[PDB]
Every structure is written in C-alpha cells, then in structure tokens.
Amino acid sequence: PSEELINMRRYRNAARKLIHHYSLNSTSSTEYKISDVVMTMIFLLRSEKYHSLFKLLETTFDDYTCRPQMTQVQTDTLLDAVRSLLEMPSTTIDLTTVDIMRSSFARCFNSPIMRYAKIVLLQNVALQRDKRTTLEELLIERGEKIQMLQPQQYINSGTEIPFCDDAEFLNRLLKHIDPYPLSRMYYNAANTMFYTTMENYAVSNCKFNIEDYNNIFKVMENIRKHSNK
Amino acid sequence: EKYHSLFKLLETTFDDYTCRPQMTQVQTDTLLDAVRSLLEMPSTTIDLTTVD
C-alpha cells in the first residue's frame, strides 16, 4: 500500500525498452514519453543495486561532459550488474556502450526543451581525444600495418563452383519461406548496417557520414538512368 | 602541510578534463575556509564557482 506499490513489471519493461533503444540502438519504436523516464529512474532507485550505476548517472546533472573516472574494480562490478540487470546474453556489452549511454543522458537533461525535438544528436564528445582528426591519416595508418600483416590462409583457388539441384527440396524451402513480409523486415536490417557505419568509430568519428551514404541510395536512380540510357 | 588536500585536488587535473570527485560537507567547508585563510581578502564572497 506504499507508493512503491507499483507495476514494477511495467517499470522494468519500460526501463529495458529505453536501454535497449538508446544503447543497443535496437530497432524502430515510438519511445517518445519523457514521463516514464522518471518511472525508470525510480525503478533504479528502488534498489541500492542499480543505484550504484545511478551514482555515475547523477553526474549528468552537472552537464559538463567530463570524461568519467574509473575505479577499476567497481567499474568491473558496474559492467557486471549492467549486463545482469539488462538480462542480455552477454553480447560483449562494454565500457564503450556504457559511456555512449552516459553521454546519451548527458544530452537529455541538457534540453529544458518540451517542444517536439527533431534532434538526432548522432555526435559524441567523449572520443578519448582532444579533437577529431581526418580519416586520411587513418587511411595511411591502418593500410600500412595491413600491408605489414601476412595471409592467414591459402585458397586452393583452382577452378571450383558449388551448386545444388534438389528442385523439390528448394521448393519446400520456398514454401517454408513464403509468409514473411521481408519487404518490411529488411529495412531495419539496413538500418542496422547504417548504425554500424558510425558505431564503427568512437574515434575522431567521421562527420560526413551523411550525403555520400545518401548517394549510395541515389545509385538506385543511377541504375534507373542506366536502364533509360 | 595545512593546505595539502586542497593542493592535491588542484593538482589532479594535470590531465585534461577529468572529473574531480565530489566532497563531503566537511571537506568542502574546510576547503573554503583554507581558501579564505590563504587568500584573506574577505572583501569579496569566496565562492565554489571560483573553483571551477
């Protein structure tokens, strides 16, 4: 009968939803209530566990994007409890994801802004450097060591091609495949690749992710032009 | 010796933009006191933000 008498299940599901969004960047959703952010925080604070994370998360409120200090052992227990409470299958959820989320929260309250916000703050400050370099230097630096590195395998590389011909089998496959609205289902996959395109770096990250990535899709219209001579 | 906790706290940030830890009531108060005690110019309101 205390105020804690709550849909803890609802609050859990919504906390997990929020984390799943902002951290894993999982998939399209409509995660557009400031309201239940509070429900999430209180769901945290109904334990000194997870409040342990909140100890760090509080530092958002001073809003300066200072690079967080590590106390190594406790940060390790932090990572532990993080993945645990997230109940994820230990998908290598690491310090980089952690600080990404930290910066997410260090971007949220930043808004005193209640009007609808079209603001995809793709950027992150905390890239362990004073300021962003170009990519060209890395095009030097990785290429060099790559040329230093030596092949991990041989290919026999003679004439080989595989094929199969069990037409009935293949049709059985087709039928099993039939239901899926792949049309829908794969756009999110493409978005996955997109996310990965910038997740690739927390390291002087590319600014011009935008318009050449868009040009890739313009290549479809280029294909239509090639069809139309 | 008097000022050493303060002193080392100032020293901390030889590396850029590290998060200086939070301090207890007592710590902050002795800090402000010692600040005034070295810079005994109470003509102005010695203040936290001065530290930042």
Curated annotation (Swiss-Prot), chain A:
| Compartments it resides in | Host nucleus; Virion
This protein's major location comes to host cell
Q: Which organism is it from?
A: Autographa californica nuclear polyhedrosis virus (AcMNPV)
Q: What does this protein do?
A: Plays a role in host nuclear actin polymerization by recruiting p78/73 protein that is capable of activating an actin-related protein 2/3 complex to initiate nuclear actin polymerization.
Q: Which residues constitute the signal peptide according to the record?
A: none
Keyword Cell inner membrane listed? The answer is no
- Tell me what this protein is called: Protein C42
The record's keywords, sorted A to Z, are: Host nucleus, Late protein, Virion
- Write out the GO cellular component annotations: host cell nucleus; virion component
Record-stated family: Belongs to the baculoviridae C42 protein family.
Give all cystine bridges in this chain. none
Note the subunit structure.
Answer: Forms a complex with proteins E27 and p78/83. The interaction with p78/83 mediates nuclear translocation of P78/83. Interacts with protein Ac102. Interacts with IE0.
Please specify the portion of the entire protein covered by the chain, as first and last position out of its full length.
Answer: 109 to 337 of 361
